[PDB]
Amino acid sequence: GPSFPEPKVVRSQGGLLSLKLSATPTPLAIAGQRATLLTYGGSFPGPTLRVRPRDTVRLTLENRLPEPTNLHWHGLPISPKVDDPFLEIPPGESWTYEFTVPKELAGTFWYHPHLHGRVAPQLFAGLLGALVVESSLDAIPELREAEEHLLVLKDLALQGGRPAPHTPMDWMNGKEGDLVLVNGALRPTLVAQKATLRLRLLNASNARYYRLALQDHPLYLIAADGGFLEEPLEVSELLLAPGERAEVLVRLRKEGRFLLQALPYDRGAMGMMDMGGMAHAMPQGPSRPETLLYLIAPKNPKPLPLPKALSPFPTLPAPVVTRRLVLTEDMMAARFFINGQVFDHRRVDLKGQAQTVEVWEVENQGDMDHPFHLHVHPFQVLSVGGRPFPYRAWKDVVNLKAGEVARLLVPLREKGRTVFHCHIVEHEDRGMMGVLEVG
Numbered sequence: 001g002p003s004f005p006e007p008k009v010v011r012s013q014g015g016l017l018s019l020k021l022s023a024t025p026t027p028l029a030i031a032g033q034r035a036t037l038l039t040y041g042g043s044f045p046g047p048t049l050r051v052r053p054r055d056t057v058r059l060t061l062e063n064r065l066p067e068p069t070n071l072h073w074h075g076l077p078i079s080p081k082v083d084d085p086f087l088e089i090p091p092g093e094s095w096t097y098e099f100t101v102p103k104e105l106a107g108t109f110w111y112h113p114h115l116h117g118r119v120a121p122q123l124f125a126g127l128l129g130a131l132v133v134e135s136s137l138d139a140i141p142e143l144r145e146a147e148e149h150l151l152v153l154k155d156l157a158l159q160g161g162r163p164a165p166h167t168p169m170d171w172m173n174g175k176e177g178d179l180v181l182v183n184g185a186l187r188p189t190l191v192a193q194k195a196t197l198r199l200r201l202l203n204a205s206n207a208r209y210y211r212l213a214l215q216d217h218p219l220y221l222i223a224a225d226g227g228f229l230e231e232p233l234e235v236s237e238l239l240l241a242p243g244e245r246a247e248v249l250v251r252l253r254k255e256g257r258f259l260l261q262a263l264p265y266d267r268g269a270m271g272m273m274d275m276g277g278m279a280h281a282m283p284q285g286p287s288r289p290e291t292l293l294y295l296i297a298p299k300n301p302k303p304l305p306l307p308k309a310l311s312p313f314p315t316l317p318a319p320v321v322t323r324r325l326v327l328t329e330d331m332m333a334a335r336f337f338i339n340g341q342v343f344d345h346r347r348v349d350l351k352g353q354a355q356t357v358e359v360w361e362v363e364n365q366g367d368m369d370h371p372f373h374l375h376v377h378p379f380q381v382l383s384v385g386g387r388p389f390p391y392r393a394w395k396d397v398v399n400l401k402a403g404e405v406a407r408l409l410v411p412l413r414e415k416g417r418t419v420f421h422c423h424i425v426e427h428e429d430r431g432m433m434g435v436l437e438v439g
């Protein structure tokens with residue numbers, strides 16, 4: 001129908017989003033070919049859930065997979081008793097997630113499986129969808145009058161009409177696929193009807209990075225992972241690591257066709273080489289450039305003025321502890337560590353106090369990029385690689401290139417046991433995850 005494919009939207013009704021969603025192997029048409037994927041709601045991506053603060057969400061997940069699964073409400077600062085990373089929904093069983101959307105929340109979030117050891121294959125097979133929290137700021141004219149679209153960035157590889165299996169190298173690097181899709185479509189065309197576009201961006205890939213650039217145009221960052229910036233930030237490109245989100249304004253400057261591209265980016269993935277007594281790992285180097293979509297500008301584009309301001313970032317109490325988390329790798333074993341340990345669901349690694357603020361220094365001592373994710377407690381990135389972060393906004397995933405230190409301001413919110421881990425999900429399944437208990 002519409003030239004631009006976008007997941008179906010389910011909205012709350014009278015302050016309640018009540019929905020039954022089954023995770024099921026589903027025959028689909030994807031990228032001009034028939035394939036059986038694992039989907040929520042029979043679609044890839046799963047449906048977009050659009051809610052408002054203080055809405056009630058009642059989501060019954062029926063597991064029709066041959067293996068156990070669960071849901072992670074990625075980015076939502078709700079209770080880890082609801083967003084429970086240790087829950088197992090057995091095959092054939094159902095579980096109902098009921099939570100209230102926090103009052104002070106806005107932006108693009110998402111849901112996907114989080115059963116340790118099975119995350120990478122289930123996510124890669126198509127189990128993912130977006131959750132949008134619409135705010136009163138969406139009513140200001142500079143945003144309301146913009147044309148809005150969600151872009152779910154997720155790649156795929158097919159073998160015999162099914163998701164390609166994980167190889168040993170996939171477990172080491174994180175699996176990337178040759179089909180680089182937007183909303184499950186291969187290089188769709190967006191024929192813009194307005195000159196200002198508001199694009200909600202989601203990197204739902206296992207491991208692929210998206211070094212985003214729109215031909216002949218800057219991007220205006222207005223929101224990060226878990227909330228608005230304080231004011232629009234002009235960027236020439238925008239890197240989205242696995243699990244990250246962003247919202248940008250695009251102000252179309254002239255008529256024409258403009259490529260939105262994932263420019264070449266070296267995240268440190270490795271190959272293997274044998275050159276006579278060698279048999280050692282070699283960098284894959286940068287990814288080849290990918291076209292994500294074709295953007296057709298309307299006739300005589302006159303974009304709206306940018307919003308002068310978005311949302312003030314909260315003033316946070318002085319922190320009461322500093323934590324250091326060091327990431328390391330054993331590439332040939334495909335094992336990944338935090339402070340020298342692999343995940344153990346029985347072991348509590350960190351113990352913090354709710355409503356206190358902590359400083360987290362996360363240090364990448366590996367040679368690969370590692371996008372560090374913390375559940376339940378959104379954070380403020382202060383600096384990465386010794387460079388001050390140029391905006392204030394809630395994030396829940398922060399990318400660390402090799403050698404870099406990120407300093408995060410972490411306010412602890414809901415009490416309970418939750419996790420932190422690399423969002424190259426193969427690395428999480430292979431041990432790069434730890435346990436935080438908030439009391």
Ligand SMILES: [Cu+2]
Nearest residue numbers: 072074112243
């Ligand atoms: Cu996630």
Ligand SMILES: [Cu+2]
Nearest residue numbers: 072074075375
């Ligand atoms: Cu998460």
Ligand SMILES: [Cu+2]
Nearest residue numbers: 370422424427
């Ligand atoms: Cu990693």
Ligand SMILES: [Cu+2]
Nearest residue numbers: 072114375421
């Ligand atoms: Cu997680």
